[PDB]
Amino acid sequence: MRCIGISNRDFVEGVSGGSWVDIVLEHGSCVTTMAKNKPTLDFELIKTEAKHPATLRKYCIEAKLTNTTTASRCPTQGEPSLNEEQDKRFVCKHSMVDRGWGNGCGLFGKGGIVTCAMFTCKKNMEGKIVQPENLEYTIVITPHSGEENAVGQDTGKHGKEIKVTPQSSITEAELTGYGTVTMECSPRTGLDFNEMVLLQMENKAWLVHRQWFLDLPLPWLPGADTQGSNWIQKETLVTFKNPHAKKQDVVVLGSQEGAMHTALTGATEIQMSSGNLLFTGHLKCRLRMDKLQLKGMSYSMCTGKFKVVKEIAETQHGTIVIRVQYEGDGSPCKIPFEIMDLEKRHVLGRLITVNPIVTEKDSPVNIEAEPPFGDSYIIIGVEPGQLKLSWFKKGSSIGQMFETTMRGAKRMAILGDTAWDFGSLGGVFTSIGKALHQVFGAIYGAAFSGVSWTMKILIGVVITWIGMNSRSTSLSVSLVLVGVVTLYLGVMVQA
C-alpha cells in the first residue's frame, strides 16, 4: 500500500493472455497493478546504483599561478625565449611591447615579449562513466494486505525489495502469503548510460550528457593521467594583460564553482559520495502474475460486526481508504466490502485492496477502494450489524477522462516511445504506435536538440502560424499538429 499517498501514482489494470503486464517504474513514482483475482501489488523504484565507474576526464575549476617569468626580444629580432616554455605546466603567451632607447633596445619598434607562469590546480571536477552491466536497480514490491501501518509506509516493512541487474533477466520475489512475483526488467534500455557522464564536484554530483561534458571549456586532464600536472587548455582559466603595450602579466581567473553550478542547469543531481547513487530515471519491467495468489483466498466471510477505527479519507487519485477493526469470531476471515448506489441495488465501486481479510481479531485492517463519481455508498459487514457509510466524490467522468489524457501525454513527454509499453498487454496497435513514435521522436529530437523551452515555444508558434497560413489542407493540418505538439513540449519541458 506504499503508493497510497503519492501524487505520481499510476494504476495498471489487467494482464495479457500469458498473465503478464509490462510496466515502467520511474523514480519518485510508483505503480499499483491489479488484475482479476490477483493480489494487487504496488511497485516503486527506490534506488539505482552504479558500480566500478571509470574517470573519463578531470577538469580544473580552481587554479593558482607561481613562478611568473618574462622575456623580451628587440624589434625585428624574432621572438623571445624562456626555458619555462619547454614545460607544459607553464602557461605562456607571446605579445608585443614598445621598445626603444629608453627600455634598452637599439631599434624603435614592437619587440617580442613572452610571459610564463606555473599552473597548479586547486579544485577538480572529475567526471566518471559506467557500463550498463554495473547498473543495479532496487525495486520494492508491497502487497496491499490492509496491514495496520502499511497504508503509506515507505520504510519497506511488509514489502519485499528486489535488486534488478543486467546479469539476470529474471527477478523473483517470494511475497509471504501471496506467492511469487516474477519481473523481467530491462536495465539496459532505461537511462542511456555510456553516453552519460557522472560528474562529481565538491561533494555534489550530477548526471550529465557525455558530449556536453567533453565540450566543457575548462582545463582538463585525460582521465588516465596520474601526475595531475599536465593540464591542457589552461588558457581557458587564465588571463594575459597588455594594457598599453609596455608589459604583459598573468592572472589565474578565479574559482569556477558557481559558473559550473550555473552550467549544470537542466541536469539532474545524484549522490556520488558513497556508491554513485542515482534517484532519477525509469525502468521497464514485464510483470508475471502466474504464481501470485490472494492471501485471503480459501477464507470464510466475516460474519461478525465491524467498526471504523480511521474515518474515510479521499486520496489524490479518486480513491478512498478506510480502516476497520473486526469484533467477532472466526478471526481469519475475509471482510465483506461493497460500494453501492444510494438505493443499494448496484455495486458501483471498485476495490483496490481486493480480498480484504481480517488476519487477527484486534488488528485494524485498512482498505482502499475507488468509489464512483457522486453519491456512492460503502457497506462493510453482513446484514446483522453491517457498517452503513455514505460518501460523495467530487469530480466527473469527463473530467477524469481529461485528467487521464493529460497524464498519458505527460508520460509521453517524460518518456519517449517507452511510454507506449507502460501498461501494454502485447497488442498490435501498441506496437504500431510505438514504432511510429520511435520514428517521429527520432526526427523531433534531431530537430530540437540543445534548445531551451522558450525557443521551443517560439518555434511552435512559428510552425503553427505557417500551418494556419498554408494553402494545402494536409500540410496545414500537419504543421498545426507539429506546432501544437511543440508548444506542449515547450510548456512541459525542463522539470
Binding site: 552519460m196 550528457h209 552550467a263 537542466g266 539532474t268 543531481e269 534517484f279 532519477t280 523551452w453 522539470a495
Partner: protein, 75 residues
C-alpha cells in the same frame, strides 16, 4: 565561461526535477526584460529595422523578437 553553455536541452530530463529548474526557468526572460528596460534606444532601433526589413507583420514581429533577444545575448 562554462555558464554560457548550460545543460538545458540535452534530452536527458526525467520526472525528477533538474538542478536549478525553478531558478533557471525564467532567468533568460528576466534578463532580456531588464536589458530592454535599461536600453530602450536599441529596442526602438530594432523595431524600426524590423518594420523596414519585414514585408508582412508576421515577419516584422518575428525579426523584432529575434533582434531583441539576440542583442543582450551576443553581449
Amino acid at each position: 565561461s562554462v555558464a554560457l553553455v548550460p545543460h538545458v536541452g540535452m534530452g536527458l530530463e526525467t520526472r525528477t526535477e533538474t538542478w536549478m529548474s525553478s531558478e533557471g526557468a525564467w532567468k533568460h526572460a528576466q534578463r532580456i526584460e531588464t536589458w530592454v528596460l535599461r536600453h530602450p534606444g536599441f529596442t526602438i532601433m530594432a523595431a524600426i529595422l524590423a518594420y523596414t526589413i519585414g514585408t508582412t507583420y508576421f515577419q516584422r514581429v518575428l525579426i523584432f523578437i529575434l533582434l531583441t533577444a539576440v542583442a543582450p545575448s551576443m553581449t
